[PDB]
What we know:
This protein has strands at 2-8, 12-18, 34-39, 42-45, 54-57, 60-62, 77-80, 88-94, 98-104, 122-127, 130-135, 139-145, 148-150, 165-168. The protein is mostly beta strands. It has two domains: 1-83, Crystallins (Gamma-B Crystallin, domain 1, Sandwich); 84-173, Sandwich (Gamma-B Crystallin, domain 1), CATH 2.60.20.10. The N and C termini lie close together (11 Å). Pfam families: Crystall (PF00030).
Amino acid sequence: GKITFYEDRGFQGRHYECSSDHSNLQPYFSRCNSIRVDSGCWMIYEQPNFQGPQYFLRRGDYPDYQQWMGLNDSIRSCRLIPHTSSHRLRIYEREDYRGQMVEITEDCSSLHERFHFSEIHSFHVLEGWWVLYEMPNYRGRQYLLRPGDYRRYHEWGAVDARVGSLRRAVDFY
């Protein structure tokens, strides 16, 4: 993985090239207004130690923070999302894996419209890392999901229960 942060928009100003996880980016730049990702899938955060609002980045240009749907130019930590050989997850109508269920292996752009049940309250990530979005079409607040149990919203770090879309974190070979 390779990512480069720039202090000004349009890839201008002081910049820092990165190839691994950093729990504290403060020593490298005080503001981040544009990012260019050369390889790998990344999750950037507003606070150190991967805390606070999180954002997903793929290869390519992010000329402004609005490109990654950020709230401001304060990025203090980054995570290179691990690569897995596959992706698999179960979606449940009720908490604690109760109610109707569907097992998926591909992206879902609208959680409340694609299945036979519209209420969504728990997830079981069996394989691969995914990004859960608050709104449909991969927008709104984001929550990175690594393999594990998510019997209720508190488990994925949300203070809100609103969900809308789900995408697999995948990069080319």
